[PDB]
């Protein structure tokens, strides 16, 4: 759906890459987290490293993403999820707004 | 406090002035409304209008802003606010990064 609700929400954003990812952490009434997030157009791929595996949800726009060792880039569009394995990493690139939703898995 | 408690928070975000504001929705148990934004660091004042009177929260950082027909900038830190009368405006600027929440009145 468009929205989450009964959740909390932490105020303090995390902000990278100069500016181009802002998120939010959202947490859910099972004690569950995920973050609600935008990456800003981006000239180079953006790297980001994961520790438990993640799943990226796309909300609205349009991304191509490199996961973990794969070479070629891999095209997600609203309403797509792409999987992140645990200890691995994945490089995105936009050209628009990107909002996005990642769950903890 | 550091979180909002038992709200629905729309997951598609609103940015302007080229990604330099990004913001969502957030709505509370009685119906009310809040913004939940960021305001990266601006080279020139960003200018946002009023329909509804507004306080802005800083959560975050440090601004100067100009209210209204007001012609010199106020300094506002985290933890403090302003007002906005309703069909008005504001001016703001910052040289690092600036959470806060808009607050309809």
Same mark, same amino acid.
């Not at 880039?73 to 999820?81: N, P």
């Given at each position: $759906?468009?929205? *989450?609700? @009964? /959740?909390?929400?932490?105020?303090? $954003?995390? =902000?990278? *890459? #100069? #500016?181009?990812?802002?998120? %939010?952490? /959202? ?5 569950? !987290? ?13 790297? *980001?490293?994961? %520790? /438990? ?11 191509? +993403?490199?996961?973990?060792? $794969? ?10 999820? *792409?999987? =992140?394995?645990?200890? $691995?990493?994945? !490089?995105?690139?936009?050209?628009? +707004?990107?909002?996005? /939703?990642? @769950?903890?898995?």
């Amino acid at each position: $759906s468009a929205q *989450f609700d @009964h /959740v909390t929400v932490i105020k303090k $954003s995390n =902000v990278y *890459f #100069g #500016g181009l990812c802002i998120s %939010h952490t /959202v947490q859910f009434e099972d004690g569950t !987290k995920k973050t609600l997030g935008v990456i800003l157009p981006t000239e180079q791929p953006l790297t *980001f490293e994961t %520790h /438990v595996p993640e799943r990226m949800e796309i909300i609205s726009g349009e991304c191509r +993403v490199k996961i973990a060792d $794969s070479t070629e880039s891999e095209l997600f569009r609203a309403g797509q999820s *792409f999987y =992140v394995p645990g200890n $691995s990493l994945f !490089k995105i690139e936009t050209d628009e +707004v990107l909002d996005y /939703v990642c @769950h903890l898995e």
